Design a binder for this molecule. Structure first.
Ligand SMILES: NC(=O)C1=CN([C@@H]2O[C@H](COP(=O)(O)OP(=O)(O)OC[C@H]3O[C@@H](n4cnc5c(N)ncnc54)[C@H](O)[C@@H]3O)[C@@H](O)[C@H]2O)C=CC1
Ligand SMILES: NC(=O)C1=CN([C@@H]2O[C@H](COP(=O)(O)OP(=O)(O)OC[C@H]3O[C@@H](n4cnc5c(N)ncnc54)[C@H](O)[C@@H]3O)[C@@H](O)[C@H]2O)C=CC1
Ligand SMILES: NC(=O)C1=CN([C@@H]2O[C@H](COP(=O)(O)OP(=O)(O)OC[C@H]3O[C@@H](n4cnc5c(N)ncnc54)[C@H](O)[C@@H]3O)[C@@H](O)[C@H]2O)C=CC1
Ligand SMILES: NC(=O)C1=CN([C@@H]2O[C@H](COP(=O)(O)OP(=O)(O)OC[C@H]3O[C@@H](n4cnc5c(N)ncnc54)[C@H](O)[C@@H]3O)[C@@H](O)[C@H]2O)C=CC1
Ligand SMILES: C[C@H](OC(=O)Cc1ccc(Cl)c(SC2=C(O)C[C@H](c3c(Cl)cccc3Cl)CC2=O)c1)c1ccccc1
Ligand SMILES: C[C@H](OC(=O)Cc1ccc(Cl)c(SC2=C(O)C[C@H](c3c(Cl)cccc3Cl)CC2=O)c1)c1ccccc1
Ligand SMILES: C[C@H](OC(=O)Cc1ccc(Cl)c(SC2=C(O)C[C@H](c3c(Cl)cccc3Cl)CC2=O)c1)c1ccccc1
Ligand SMILES: C[C@H](OC(=O)Cc1ccc(Cl)c(SC2=C(O)C[C@H](c3c(Cl)cccc3Cl)CC2=O)c1)c1ccccc1
Lengths: 323, 331, 331, 331
């Protein structure tokens, strides 16, 4: 017989559907950082990568496979074809190119039907920008119920905010609580009322917190969050590590059904006086069926107005998109 | 009082010196993969990054910082100046010249030696008691160069060496056998890369020797062509370079595994490059990979592997070549 | 309206089923050790506990529940009714009667069998596709009993077997050699406990055979008495019982290690007890420990270890003795 | 030549003073649950166990050591003699007397003080620069006792305090809301146990205050009986003792969490007992739980929680009671 047959007696060949599979579509710096963080957190028993650039895709796959000794994910696959994504619990989209929106919409027109073909019951986690519009696009094309379409939204915005908060206060980010919500990016909203350490509201201690009458200009913290993005791009040409970690954290709650609360993009129709089909970030409960619940944050009139304004602009763009 | 003073009462401001600090020098693809893997394994209470390209360095540092909420390493710093690296337990060198030969009129050994000539004395100044882990290529020559320049004892200079080679070999082995690479044991030793040596006699699952079951294993007589497994390790390197331009994930995962044994004083055995004088008839100051016991003192012990005459000749040939090059170096 | 509804808007309500449920049956010293180890390794999204002592059961459940903040296992349930165990991927049996003064091990067997006659049908009823992992003693016999009663295919019935014997062996080996047990390879096989078999030919560090290096290894001629290392494994069992009244931490950790490979489909190789009829000249339905590949279908494969004549005779002796007891058991 | 020397060439004969060492004193259920949790979280490179019952102590150590293969804490030691504890970064005290039927919790204190009179000077003798983490009950008084006997600055003496109460509370809150305890924030402060104070104003999910949404939160007139949640925290303590005879898993898990912030200098905020003189009109040397920042120097900062008038009155009453007891203690 072969060496393998001399060495190993087989009891059954009966291979099985992968039980905890995750796919990452798009193997740019963002997708691969998602891949590595997911791998080192032992969240999946199979990982699939998809891209249109065949060379890089094989390269990244092999590089990951070569680390198998140090991981606990026994099967890593990749391909142009979506048959490699079959039976994913979680499919994470990081692929992408106003005109930029239609191009990413056209990309999604190809990706989403393929993903849905091979993992009809998967959850979709959208990272591609602009994330709130593209979460809408993903939801529209897939036909999935809203709970199964999660946009990264303000997850990154909030993580950066809490890092910066932690810096100012001399406290680990984990113990510095604060929510950045609404539209991901430039137009996000820092909810000053919720900012606290150990349940001590900073706004209560300092009622001018985050206003232009704030002596300490905590507004700058939120502004630093947005400038940070442009700076990191200017400094190294892309962003990778932080988004990747943030995405793996969402994957963790979902894959392990933790029901933790995260700032992610979800259908916000019916809230804050919004009536259109737009996705915005609120704190959501994440688990095996995706977003099952959301927290009803009390917003001020000014905060509601910002959210409302974002929704109007997003719908303005969305209604003109060609599917 | 400020909002900070209203929220927080301070007991003292003393001290603040890191207990488990790690430094990565050279934040390219390899360095940053080492960094992320180390952060996600909770090996350090502090991570420092150094490079000569100031913008990239700052961007990379910020990016890692922005992920703080998802990590347990509370302080990440960076700078051109080595003062950020002070009091490191472990310093990892992944710096090196660009691939495009036209960037310089010197060859890679020369360029990377001049780079080490700049890096090593500055690391030593600020972390005299650190362990040095050398990744940069050619890794065996450069581990020797780090040893010569640092003045460190042998145990405190560790070359990545055949750690990646072995990790790749076990991956491919696990694929042929249908067994996780953790349970597929096999050692690739000697000179890192093209000239590495797969030690057939030690390849086993559960203490059952593959060479014993299948005596043609590794020979040209072998009908299953197991020699090709080692050949595939070498080809993999060049293929991944062609496909994506560099390698990062595997090497970075492999470096973190060494850092784990070192930072936690595990005394696990890894295939890494160490001063090999005294073994295999090798009488020169050369570094080659053999299985080494890694802990808080670096390489405290090495395993004396019984090699075949061929295997021994290959290691000896590598030592001859390496020393041939090294003897002409100017410090 | 409740504060819950004031605070939280529900999107959908459907009760979902756990995707990675594990049951522990018997919440004595061993059971709870397995539980805490499984909780701390993030292996399950749901943990169920089952016992017949109702107050202890509830208390153990509550105590675990109270650490939820520091864990990532969202639901922990308990009850004497096996409906709490529905759809477990893995069911660990650690239930066992207490051996009385003047009671022999032979006598104990039938008492543990009677316990299994109640437990096994209930398990199979609510989780017909689970992997059964048997810890209860004498473990090789009770693994057979579990297999008999359940009607399961042999791949889904796993005895803890020589997994603990092997962990203790490798710990002692590591102490002798000054190497982490992770890097000290060695297999204790056959019948768990007193009659287990240390396979000298497979002991190695970095693939370097200790027996090749030291031919008298494990024989009476051995000046270093390595045979006493196996003897210490056996004596250590009795000594821990004598000192603290039971063994818990080591067994719990060893069980979590197996659980990890099973739940994560790792295909690592472990020394566990499996149906070995057809090997080593054994014709009887008996379970003994060989290295097995563990994944989501239990034992998909086993490694065929090359045993010396003495080693085979010792396994065959165990099989004859085990069968001799098994033939007289009342099911 | 010994087999070890044939197999292994030694580079240097070691050995560094312990670098990341933890001692646990008292190996009852609490101490051992702290031990296993610390071990499974890779917080220390050396662990030491102390107790006055020698066989139990030895057995527990052997049991942990036997699990080494599955751990990454390479040195585990124990002894009645405190030299085993030398150079610990962190020493965790879980030793205490058995409270006898009909004994007041009053003179229980002094019995425990007598234990500390022996323990504390011994700890200081061998690790004069450690942090003390006190678990033994009544924890706020015994933390004061360790402070006085040790001579340590207040930053280096930490009481487990309301850490467990808060973890139970957040579990219960998480149950009601259908949210993971990690996302359910809420602080139980003051005196550990019966007289602890649930701080209703800080209780929140995602920064949304439950007290603001629900003004009756914490009152008797509250239709939803949220006050019962804090009541259940204290009732669950007596209930767990009634059902299983002791508590272990949750306290163990909570202590490891504190240990993690200390050993890794995380500067996370925890509800633990600290010397509170100067706050809340408290004018005596007493230790009560407030949110503290924990890192390498123990408690470096504390969060100044805004308390209501009757929350303040509750802390002050505990202070008065605790002090009343302490000033009668014999050292
Ligand atoms: N939501 C958030 O907080 C953040 C979102 N992002 C966004 O993530 C996206 C990706 O970022 P990068 O990796 O830096 O971009 P990238 O351009 O480096 O990577 C994009 C990848 O998508 C691939 N791709 C394009 N069309 C495809 C198709 N039809 N099928 C499969 N793959 C396809 C490309 O080949 C490319 O490899 C961007 O849209 C970026 O703006 C980035 C950071 C944060
Ligand atoms: N030993 C092994 O198994 C492996 C070794 N390598 C080697 O690792 C090295 C790095 O790999 P890559 O990340 O792809 O190279 P890279 O060019 O992408 O990164 C090198 C970094 O070193 C920096 N650097 C140059 N001079 C410096 C100085 N004086 N001080 C500080 N930093 C300096 C550069 O600015 C650059 O950022 C290469 O030599 C490569 O061959 C790569 C894979 C495996
Ligand atoms: N294979 C191995 O390496 C090892 C096996 N063991 C075995 O594990 C078994 C238990 O060990 P310990 O936890 O120390 O004993 P233990 O007495 O502390 O725990 C046994 C538990 O089994 C429970 N039980 C009895 N009948 C039951 C039933 N019908 N349903 C559910 N639960 C039931 C008891 O109530 C008790 O709680 C013993 O048989 C022991 O020999 C122990 C150590 C190692
Ligand atoms: N602060 C908190 O939140 C909690 C505190 N506790 C307390 O922790 C303490 C221990 O709990 P258990 O482990 O269940 O008690 P236990 O009585 O089972 O264990 C106590 C151990 O301390 C040892 N000991 C006694 N005197 C000693 C000495 N001079 N030196 C060294 N060791 C000595 C005993 O020998 C015994 O093994 C108790 O006081 C208990 O009240 C328990 C749960 C929670
Ligand atoms: C939405 C985003 O622009 C913004 O609103 C700025 C902003 C503010 C606050 C935060 Cl937290 C982030 S996270 C983040 C991104 O979302 C992408 C950023 C980026 C990339 Cl990947 C590439 C080119 C430019 C940029 Cl700003 C990097 C990066 O850090 C981004 C955008 C970028 C490109 C196309 C469309 C929209
Ligand atoms: C030592 C190496 O050449 C070899 O012998 C080929 C080889 C065989 C077997 C293995 Cl396991 C590896 S690991 C590995 C490297 O060491 C670097 C490789 C590489 C890079 Cl980073 C850049 C350009 C070319 C190459 Cl081959 C990538 C990669 O996968 C590499 C070398 C590369 C550049 C300069 C000097 C020497
Ligand atoms: C199989 C076992 O006896 C042996 O053969 C001795 C032995 C040798 C080597 C190893 Cl590694 C172990 S592991 C182990 C056990 O399996 C149970 C031991 C034990 C318990 Cl829990 C209770 C009473 C006595 C014992 Cl020996 C503790 C313990 O450490 C045990 C047995 C016990 C009771 C009934 C029937 C059989
Ligand atoms: C301070 C404590 O009494 C209380 O106030 C009750 C209480 C209320 C709320 C919480 Cl969170 C806890 S945590 C906890 C303990 O601290 C010990 C408890 C306990 C043990 Cl270990 C043994 C006998 C009785 C008890 Cl109540 C168990 C347990 O869960 C305890 C005490 C117990 C014995 C001696 C002296 C003081």
């Amino acid at each position: 017989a072969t060496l393998k047959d001399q060495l190993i007696y087989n009891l059954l060949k009966e291979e099985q559907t992968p039980q905890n599979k995750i796919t990452v579509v798009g193997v740019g710096a963002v997708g691969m950082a998602c891949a590595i963080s997911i791998l080192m957190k032992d969240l999946a028993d199979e990982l699939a990568l998809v891209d249109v650039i065949e060379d890089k895709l094989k390269g990244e796959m092999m590089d990951l496979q070569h680390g198998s000794l140090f991981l606990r994910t026994p099967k890593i696959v990749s391909g142009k074809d979506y048959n490699v994504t079959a039976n994913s619990k979680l499919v994470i989209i990081t692929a992408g190119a106003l005109n930029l929106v239609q191009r990413n919409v056209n990309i999604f027109k190809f990706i989403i039907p393929n993903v849905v073909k091979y993992s009809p019951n998967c959850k979709l986690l959208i990272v591609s920008n602009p994330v709130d519009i593209l979460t809408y696009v993903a939801w529209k094309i897939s036909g999935f119920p809203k709970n199964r379409v999660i946009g990264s939204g303000c997850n990154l915005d909030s993580a950066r905010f809490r890092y910066l908060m932690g810096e100012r206060l001399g406290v680990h980010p984990l113990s510095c609580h604060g929510w950045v919500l609404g539209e991901h990016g430039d137009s996000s909203v820092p909810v000053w009322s919720g900012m606290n350490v150990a349940g001590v509201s900073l706004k209560t201690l300092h009622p001018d917190l985050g206003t232009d009458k704030d002596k300490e200009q905590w507004k700058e913290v939120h502004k630093q969050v947005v400038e940070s993005a442009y700076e990191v791009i200017k400094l190294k040409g892309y962003t990778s590590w932080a988004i990747g970690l943030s995405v793996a954290d969402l994957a963790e709650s979902i894959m392990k059904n933790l029901r933790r609360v995260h700032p992610v993009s979800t259908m916000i129709k019916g809230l804050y006086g919004i009536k259109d089909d737009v996705f915005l970030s609120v704190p959501c409960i994440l688990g095996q069926n995706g977003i099952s619940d959301l927290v009803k944050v009390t917003l001020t009139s000014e905060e509601e107005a910002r959210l409302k304004k974002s929704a109007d602009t997003l719908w303005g763009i969305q209604k003109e998109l060609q599917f």
